[PDB]
Design a binder for this molecule. Structure first.
Ligand SMILES: Nc1nc2c(ncn2[C@@H]2O[C@H](COP(=O)(O)OP(=O)(O)OP(=O)(O)O)[C@@H](O)[C@H]2O)c(=O)[nH]1
Ligand SMILES: Nc1ncnc2c1ncn2[C@@H]1O[C@H](COP(=O)(O)OP(=O)(O)CP(=O)(O)O)[C@@H](O)[C@H]1O
Ligand SMILES: Nc1nc2c(ncn2[C@@H]2O[C@H](COP(=O)(O)OP(=O)(O)O)[C@@H](O)[C@H]2O)c(=O)[nH]1
Ligand SMILES: COc1ccc2c(c1)CCCN2c1nc(Cl)nc2cccnc12
Ligand SMILES: [Ca+2]
Ligand SMILES: [Mg+2]
Ligand SMILES: [Mg+2]
Ligand SMILES: [Mg+2]
Lengths: 437, 54, 427, 332
C-alpha cells in the first residue's frame, strides 16, 4: 500500500474537502470520532483505505489531509463541525487576512509568509508514510488563495517531492455563483504557473454543477452545500480505486498513464450519471445501458462542451453498483453505432472499465437519491478546450484595457506575468487544436 | 470487441475493451522570484512615503 | 476584521451620528451600549464596528472630530450620544470658518496629532484592522480640509490599510457659503490620491429626492440625512452581516475599482422613503430592481444614461425570492447591456441579506462605479472656475498661507479626473 | 425585447433578416462583441460555438450548425458519402467522385475500366476527358480538389438546347425539422450545350456569375418552378413534383438525416438553425443528381422577401415568440 495526501486550499478547496471526507467516512464505515469497527487490525494496517487514513493506537482513523486557508472563517467551521474529532489540529492551517480575490496577493505578498509552515505540516504527514505516492490538491481557479497560494504550493511540492505525482481537483469559475470580477485573471495566472507541476487535473465548472442541480435535483437556487455534495460524489468515483481493492487506477501514476498521453493536455473531462433527486416519490432505476449512454450527454458533464467536435485520447468508465462486464460491452456496442466517438489516430479506440460492486453512498438527508448503479466517465477529449477558449476570451477583454491590473502590480507582480501567462494559454489552445482536428 | 486483462476481486472487477487499434524551477529560483516581488513592493511603498514626506 | 470610523466637522458628525443610530438599531444595541436583540445574526460580526466593553457592552469603534465644540455637544446630547467612548471626542475651539486652508494647514494642523493618538489607540486593539471609513463634507472647512489632512496622515502611518470615505458634495441648492466649490475641488484632489473608495453623496441629489420624489417642499438637513443614513446602512450591509460573500473593504475595492483613481461610487437606494411616514405596501422584487437603477434613486446627481457602468454592487434586504432577484438583476443587464462596459465581463454582483432595515420589509441598495460621475466633478469644476477666473474670495485662503498655484493644481487634477472618466466612457 | 448581433456583414440573406427583426419592434441589435445576445447571426469561418450557451438568463440561438461543413465542402461531402453506410451502399444520386491531393490510384482504376468499356469518360475538377490533362491542373493548383464524373447527357430545355442546375433552399430549425422552401430556381445557361468543346467556358458551367448571351430566354437566366413545371407538362407530359422534386426531397432528407447525430443541438446548452442551398442536376432520363451543398447560400432576388420572412417565422420566432406555410416539411 502507498499513501496519498490530500491538500485543500482556500474556501472552495476546504469546503469540497469537507464533503469528500464526509462521504469517504460513510463509504468506509468510519464514524465522526474516527473509530472504524470493521477494521480489525487496530493501530495500523496496509489496507486499501489506509491510502487515505492513518491509524492511532486508540483505533482512530485520521485523514491524510491538510487544510489551508489564508483566513480562518471557513476552516473554523471544520474545527467546530460534525467531524471536528476526525482531524488533528495541526492539519487545519489558517491565517488572519485572505488574498482579497487577488492571485498576486495569494502567491506573493501573503503566500510567501505561510508557505514554509504549510510545507512543514505537509512534511509531518509524509513522515508517517511508508511509500508516499503523491498529492491530491483541491482549490478554486478564482479565489486569490485557491489560485495564488496553490501555485506557490505546487512549485514547492515539486522541489521537495520531485518523484511524487500531483493530481488537481479544480473549480472553474462560473458567474452564476462566482464572487469576484477578476476570476478570469486568477484562473489564467494559476494555470500558467501550475501547468508543469500537475500530472492530471480534473476541472469542475460551477456552471455545469449548478445546472445539474437545477435540472436533475429540482433545486431552484443551489447552494455550495448542494454543489459540493454532488462534487464529492464525482471525486469519490475518481478516487475509489485508490481506496478500494481492484486492478484499475490503483496508484496516482496510473491516472497519468491511463488518461494523459501528453503532459500538457492533462485535463480529463468527467461525466457522471445518474443524478436523481431524493424528493422524487417514484423513480425507475436506470440500466447499465441508460447510464452509460448518459456519459455522452453534455448535460451530465462537469464542463459543458461538445465532445462530438473534438477527439478522444483516453476513456475510462468507473462503475459503482450492480454492473457486470457483459452489460457494459453490450452498452458500449450500442453506443458506438449511435454516437460520434472519434479517437486520435495514434491511440486505440477503446474503454478502460472498472467496476465496484458497492453502490454509490449518499449522505443521509442529502439531495441525491440512492441508485442501484452509477458511472463516472473520465475522457480526455480536446472538446474541453472550449472552457479554455471561454476563459481566455474574458481575460483578453479585461487585459486589453489593463483593468484591475494595478491591484496585482501593487502586490509585487509584474505586468509581464499576465502576458506570459496568456501566451502559455494561447499555446495550450493551439496544442488542443493540433490534436483535435 | 476484444476484452482484455479481466481482473476480478470481491470488491468488483476491471478490464479493457478495444473497438479499433490505432491508425522544474529550483528552491532558490523560487525564492528569487518571491523576493524580487517583495523588493518591488518595498520600492513602491518607499516612493509613497517619499511623496507623503514632500 | 475591524473598521475604525471617523467623523469630522458638522456634516461629518451629523450623518456619522445618524449612521451609528441606524446600525445600532439593526444590531439590537441600545443607547446604553447593551445588546437587547432577537437574532444571533446581529452579533456574528458586531466586532466590525463595535468594541466589547466591560460587562458585555458594545462601544462603537468611532472617533468624533471637530474644530468647534458645537455639533459635538449636540452629538453627546443626542439619542445615542452616550454610546460613544468619551475619550474619542477630539475637538478644538477656534472653528474652521468654512475654510479648507484652516482645516488642512493652520487650525487643523494644531489638532490633527491628538486625533491620530485616538486613532492609534483604536487600531492597536484590533485583531486585524481592515481600514477606515470617514464621514465628512467637502464644502466646509473641518470635514473637508482637516478630514483630508487626517486621511493623508492615516495613509502615512497605515499604508497597507484600506481608506473608505462617505463624502458629501456641496450644492448651491443646499449651500452655506460661496466658497464651497473651492473647498470641494481642493478636497477632491486629496480623495483621488488617498482613498480606495469614496461614496459620492451629492447634496444636490438629496435635495431633489426630498423635493421631487418625497414631496417635501422645504427639506431640512434632517431630511437629507435620512436619505444618507439609509444609504450608509445599505452599503455596509455585507460588512456587518454574515452572508455567502463574507465581504470586506479590500475585496470591495478590488472588484469595484478597475483603475485606481476611478474610485468614486454613485450610491442608490429603494424604496425612497420620507421621515416618519410608513409605506404599508411592500415593493416587489421587480419594483425594487427598477427603482434602485433609476436615476431618481441615485444619491449623486448624475444621469446614469450619460455614461457606462464599470462595476455595480447591489444588496437586497428582506425575505424574498433569491431566484426572483437573480432573474430581475439579469433582466436589467440583458435589457440594458449597452450601459455596462463590455470589457469587464459579468460586472454586476448581487448580495442578499435576510434582515431588512428598520421600517421596511424589502429594500435595495445600489453601489455604482459609473463614468457618469464625471457630471458631478464637471459641475463643481464650473462653479470653481467661475470664481477663480477673477480670483474671487481667494484672500480667505492666501491669508492662511496658500498660493494661487495650489488652486491651479487642484483645478487641473480634477479636470484630468474628468477626462479620465471620459476615456472609458468611449472605450 | 429580444437581442441579436450580426457578425457576417456580407450575408444578403441575414441583412434582410436583421431588417425584418428590427422592424418587428421587439428585437434590438447590439454590437458584434456584446455577449448578452439572444440570437447570433454569425461569421462564416471560425464562428466561436464554444462561447455560446454560457450566458446565465439568456436562451441563445445561432444560424449555423457546428459540424455542418462536413456536408458543405466538396472534399468532405465525398468522404461523407463514401464512408457513411446511410448512403454509399449504392447511393444512386451522387456522381462518382474521388479526392486527390496535389503534392488517385482508386480514381484511375475506374477511368481505365471506362477506357475498356468505351463508355463516356468526361470528368470534372476544369472539364476534360484526359485524366493526365486535368491532373496536371490538379498539381499546378496546389490545394485539394475532388474529381467526379461529368454528366455528359444532361436534360436540355427547348428552345435553346441549354443546360441548367436546380437550387433548393432548405431551412433546418433548432428541433431538426427539415423545411424545404417551395420556391426553387433553375440557374440556366444561355449557351447551347456542346459535347465536343469542353474547354469552352460558358456552355457547361451554369454558375450565375460565370455567365457574365446572358438574359436571352428568361430574365436573369433564372427560370422559376411555375414556368419549369409548365415546360415539363407541355414538353414531357409530367410535372415538377413527380419527375424531379420527389428525388430532390429524398436527397435532402438523406443528407441531413445522415449527419443529424453529429450536429443536432437537441440536448445542447445553445441551439442552432441553418439555411442550406442544395444544388442539383437533372439528366435526360429525368433523374436528379446532387452536385453540392452550400452552407451560406444566397437567394434569388424575387424570393428574398418570402424566404427571409420564413426564416423568422419558423427558425427565430419559434424559439423567441413575438407579442398556409411557405415550406414543405420533410419528415423523419
Ligand atoms: N463548487 C464550489 N465553488 C466554490 C465554493 N466556494 C467558493 N467557490 C468558488 O470559488 C471561487 C471563489 O474562490 P474562493 O475559494 O472562495 O476564494 P479563496 O481561495 O478562499 O481565496 P480568497 O480570495 O483569499 O478568499 C468562485 O468561483 C466561487 O464560486 C464551494 O464551496 N463549492
Ligand atoms: N458532375 C457534374 N456534371 C455535370 N455538370 C457539373 C458537374 N459538376 C458541376 N457541374 C456544373 O458546374 C457548375 C459549378 O459546379 P459546382 O456546383 O461544383 O461549384 P459552384 O460554382 O456551383 C459553387 P456554389 O454551388 O456554392 O455556388 C454547376 O452549375 C454544373 O452546371
Ligand atoms: N447632507 C448634509 N450636508 C451638510 C450637513 N451639514 C452641512 N452640510 C453641508 O456641508 C457643507 C458645509 O460643511 P460643514 O460640515 O458644515 O463644515 P465643517 O464643520 O467645517 O466641516 C455644505 O455644503 C453643507 O451643505 C448635513 O447635516 N447633511
Ligand atoms: C462588481 O463585482 C463585485 C462587486 C462587489 C463585491 C464583489 C464583486 C466581491 C466581494 C466584495 N463585493 C462586495 N462587497 C461589499 Cl462590502 N458589499 C457588496 C454588496 C453587493 C455586492 N458585492 C459587494
Ligand atoms: Ca487497521
Ligand atoms: Mg476565502
Ligand atoms: Mg457648517
Ligand atoms: Mg460551392
Amino acid at each position: 500500500m502507498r499513501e496519498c495526501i490530500s491538500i485543500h486550499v482556500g474556501q472552495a478547496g476546504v469546503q469540497i474537502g469537507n464533503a469528500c471526507w464526509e462521504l469517504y467516512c460513510l463509504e468506509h464505515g468510519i464514524q465522526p470520532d474516527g473509530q472504524m469497527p470493521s477494521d480489525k487490525t487496530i493501530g495500523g494496517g496496509d489496507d486499501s483505505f489506509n491510502t487515505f487514513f492513518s491509524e492511532t493506537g486508540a483505533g482512530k482513523h485520521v485523514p491524510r489531509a491538510v487544510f489551508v486557508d489564508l483566513e480562518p472563517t471557513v476552516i473554523d467551521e471544520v474545527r467546530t463541525g460534525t467531524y471536528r474529532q476526525l482531524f488533528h489540529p495541526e492539519q487545519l492551517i489558517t491565517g488572519k487576512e485572505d488574498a482579497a480575490n487577488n492571485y498576486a496577493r495569494g502567491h506573493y505578498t501573503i503566500g510567501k509568509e505561510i508557505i514554509d509552515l504549510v510545507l512543514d505540516r505537509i512534511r509531518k504527514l509524509a513522515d508517517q508514510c511508508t511509500g508516499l505516492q503523491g498529492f491530491l490538491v483541491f482549490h478554486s481557479f478564482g479565489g486569490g488563495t485557491g489560485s495564488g497560494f496553490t501555485s506557490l504550493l505546487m512549485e514547492r511540492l515539486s522541489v521537495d517531492y520531485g518523484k511524487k505525482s500531483k493530481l488537481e481537483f479544480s473549480i472553474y469559475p462560473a458567474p452564476q455563483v462566482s464572487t469576484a470580477v477578476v476570476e478570469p485573471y486568477n484562473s489564467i495566472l494559476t494555470t500558467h504557473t501550475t501547468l508543469e507541476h500537475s500530472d492530471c487535473a480534473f476541472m469542475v465548472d460551477n456552471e455545469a454543477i449548478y445546472d445539474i442541480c437545477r435540472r436533475n435535483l429540482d433545486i431552484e437556487r443551489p447552494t455550495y452545500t448542494n454543489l459540493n455534495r454532488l462534487i464529492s460524489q464525482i471525486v469519490s468515483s475518481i478516487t475509489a480505486s485508490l481506496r478500494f481493492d481492484g486492478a484499475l487506477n490503483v496508484d496516482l501514476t496510473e491516472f497519468q498513464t491511463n488518461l494523459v498521453p501528453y503532459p500538457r493536455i492533462h485535463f480529463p473531462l468527467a461525466t457522471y450519471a445518474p443524478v436523481i433527486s431524493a424528493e422524487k416519490a417514484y423513480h425507475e432505476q436506470l440500466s447499465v445501458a441508460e447510464i452509460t449512454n448518459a456519459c455522452f450527454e453534455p448535460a451530465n458533464q462537469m464542463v459543458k462542451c461538445d465532445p462530438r467536435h473534438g477527439k478522444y485520447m483516453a476513456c475510462c468508465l468507473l462503475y459503482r453498483g450492480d454492473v457486470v462486464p457483459k452489460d457494459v460491452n453490450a452498452a458500449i456496442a450500442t453506443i458506438k453505432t449511435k454516437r460520434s466517438i472519434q479517437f486520435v489516430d495514434w491511440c486505440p479506440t477503446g474503454f478502460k472499465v472498472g467496476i465496484n460492486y458497492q453502490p454509490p453512498t449518499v449522505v443521509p438527508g442529502g439531495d441525491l437519491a440512492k441508485v442501484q448503479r452509477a458511472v463516472c466517465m473520465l475522457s480526455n477529449t480536446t472538446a474541453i478546450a472550449e472552457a479554455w477558449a471561454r476563459l481566455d476570451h474574458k481575460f483578453d477583454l479585461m487585459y486589453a484595457k489593463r483593468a484591475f491590473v494595478h491591484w496585482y502590480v501593487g502586490e509585487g507582480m509584474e505586468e509581464g506575468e499576465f502576458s506570459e501567462a496568456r501566451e502559455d494559454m494561447a499555446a495550450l489552445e493551439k496544442d488542443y487544436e493540433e490534436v483535435g482536428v | 470487441m476484444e476484452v482484455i486483462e479481466l481482473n476480478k476481486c470481491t470488491s468488483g472487477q476491471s478490464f479493457e475493451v478495444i473497438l479499433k487499434p490505432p491508425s522544474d524551477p529550483s528552491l532558490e529560483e523560487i525564492q528569487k522570484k518571491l523576493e524580487a516581488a517583495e523588493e518591488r513592493r518595498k520600492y513602491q511603498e518607499a516612493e509613497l512615503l517619499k511623496h507623503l514626506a514632500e | 476584521r475591524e473598521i475604525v470610523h471617523i467623523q469630522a466637522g458638522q456634516c461629518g458628525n451629523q450623518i456619522g451620528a445618524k449612521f451609528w443610530e441606524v446600525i445600532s438599531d439593526e444590531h439590537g444595541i441600545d443607547p446604553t451600549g447593551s445588546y437587547h436583540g432577537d437574532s444571533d445574526l446581529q452579533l456574528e460580526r458586531i466586532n466590525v464596528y463595535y468594541n466589547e466593553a466591560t460587562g458585555n457592552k458594545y462601544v462603537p469603534r468611532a472617533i468624533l472630530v471637530d474644530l468647534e465644540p458645537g455639533t459635538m455637544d449636540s452629538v453627546r446630547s443626542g439619542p445615542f450620544g452616550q454610546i460613544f467612548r468619551p475619550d474619542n471626542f477630539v475637538f478644538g475651539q477656534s472653528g474652521a470658518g468654512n475654510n479648507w486652508a484652516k482645516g488642512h494647514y493652520t487650525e487643523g494642523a494644531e489638532l490633527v496629532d491628538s486625533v491620530l493618538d485616538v486613532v492609534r489607540k483604536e487600531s492597536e486593539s484590533c485583531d486585524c484592522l481592515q481600514g477606515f471609513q470617514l464621514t465628512h463634507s467637502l464644502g466646509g472647512g473641518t470635514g473637508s480640509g482637516m478630514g483630508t489632512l487626517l486621511i493623508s496622515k492615516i495613509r502615512e502611518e497605515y499604508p497597507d490599510r484600506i481608506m473608505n470615505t462617505f463624502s458629501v458634495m456641496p450644492s448651491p441648492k443646499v449651500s452655506d457659503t460661496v466658497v464651497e466649490p473651492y473647498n470641494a475641488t481642493l478636497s477632491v484632489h486629496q480623495l483621488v490620491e488617498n482613498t480606495d473608495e469614496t461614496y459620492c453623496i451629492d447634496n444636490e441629489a438629496l435635495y431633489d429626492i426630498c423635493f421631487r420624489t418625497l414631496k417635501l417642499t422645504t427639506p431640512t438637513y434632517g431630511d437629507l440625512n435620512h436619505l444618507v443614513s439609509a444609504t450608509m446602512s445599505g452599503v455596509t450591509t455585507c460588512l456587518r452581516f454574515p452572508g455567502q460573500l463574507n465581504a470586506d473593504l479590500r475585496k470591495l475595492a478590488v472588484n469595484m475599482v478597475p483603475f485606481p483613481r476611478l474610485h468614486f461610487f454613485m450610491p442608490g437606494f429603494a424604496p425612497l422613503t420620507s421621515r416618519g411616514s410608513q409605506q404599508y405596501r411592500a415593493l416587489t422584487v421587480p419594483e425594487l430592481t427598477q427603482q434602485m437603477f433609476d436615476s431618481k434613486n441615485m444619491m449623486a446627481a448624475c444621469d446614469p444614461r450619460h455614461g457606462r457602468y464599470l462595476t455595480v454592487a447591489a444588496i437586497f434586504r428582506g425575505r424574498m425570492s433569491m431566484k426572483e432577484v437573480d432573474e430581475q438583476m439579469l433582466n436589467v443587464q440583458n435589457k440594458n447591456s449597452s450601459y455596462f462596459v463590455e470589457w469587464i465581463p459579468n460586472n454586476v454582483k448581487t448580495a442578499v441579506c435576510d434582515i431588512p432595515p428598520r421600517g421596511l420589509k424589502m429594500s435595495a441598495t445600489f453601489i455604482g462605479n459609473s463614468t457618469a460621475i464625471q457630471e458631478l466633478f464637471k459641475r463643481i469644476s464650473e462653479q470653481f472656475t467661475a470664481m477663480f477666473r477673477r480670483k474671487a474670495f481667494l484672500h480667505w485662503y492666501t491669508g492662511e498661507g496658500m498660493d494661487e498655484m495650489e488652486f491651479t493644481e487642484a483645478e487641473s487634477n480634477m479636470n484630468d479626473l474628468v477626462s479620465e472618466y471620459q476615456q472609458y466612457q468611449d472605450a | 425585447m429580444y437581442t441579436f448581433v450580426v457578425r457576417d456583414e456580407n450575408s444578403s440573406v441575414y441583412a434582410e433578416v436583421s431588417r425584418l427583426l428590427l422592424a418587428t419592434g421587439q428585437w434590438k441589435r447590439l454590437r458584434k462583441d456584446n455577449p448578452r445576445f439572444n440570437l447570433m447571426l454569425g461569421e462564416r469561418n471560425r464562428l466561436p460555438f464554444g462561447r455560446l450557451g454560457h450566458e446565465p438568463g439568456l436562451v441563445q440561438l445561432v444560424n449555423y450548425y457546428r459540424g455542418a461543413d462536413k456536408l458543405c465542402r466538396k472534399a468532405s461531402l465525398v468522404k461523407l458519402i463514401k464512408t457513411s453506410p446511410e448512403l454509399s451502399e449504392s447511393c444512386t444520386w451522387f456522381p462518382e467522385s474521388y479526392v486527390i491531393y496535389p503534392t488517385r490510384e482508386v480514381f484511375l482504376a475506374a477511368y481505365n475500366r471506362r477506357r475498356e468499356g468505351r463508355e463516356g469518360n468526361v470528368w470534372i475538377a476544369l472539364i476534360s476527358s484526359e485524366a493526365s490533362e486535368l491532373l496536371d491542373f490538379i498539381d499546378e493548383q496546389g490545394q485539394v480538389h475532388v474529381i467526379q464524373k461529368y454528366l455528359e447527357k444532361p436534360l436540355l430545355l427547348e428552345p435553346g438546347h441549354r443546360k441548367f442546375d436546380i437550387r433548393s433552399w432548405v431551412l433546418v430549425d433548432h428541433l431538426y425539422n427539415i423545411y424545404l422552401y417551395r420556391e426553387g430556381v433553375l440557374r440556366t445557361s444561355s449557351e447551347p450545350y456542346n459535347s465536343a468543346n469542353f474547354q469552352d467556358k460558358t456552355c457547361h458551367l451554369t454558375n450565375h456569375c460565370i455567365q457574365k448571351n446572358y438574359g436571352r430566354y428568361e430574365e436573369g437566366n433564372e427560370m422559376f418552378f411555375e414556368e419549369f413545371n409548365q415546360y415539363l407538362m407541355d414538353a414531357l407530359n409530367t410535372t415538377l413534383e413527380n419527375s424531379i422534386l420527389l428525388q430532390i426531397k429524398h436527397i435532402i432528407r438523406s443528407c441531413l438525416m445522415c449527419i443529424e447525430p453529429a450536429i443536432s443541438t437537441k440536448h445542447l446548452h445553445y441551439q442552432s438553425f441553418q439555411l442550406f442551398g442544395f444544388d442539383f442536376m437533372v439528366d435526360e432520363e429525368l433523374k436528379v443528381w446532387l452536385i453540392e451543398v452550400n452552407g451560406a447560400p444566397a437567394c434569388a432576388q424575387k424570393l428574398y422577401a418570402e424566404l427571409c420572412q420564413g426564416i423568422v417565422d419558423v427558425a427565430i420566432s419559434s424559439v423567441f415568440p413575438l407579442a398556409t406555410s411557405i415550406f414543405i416539411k420533410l419528415h423523419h
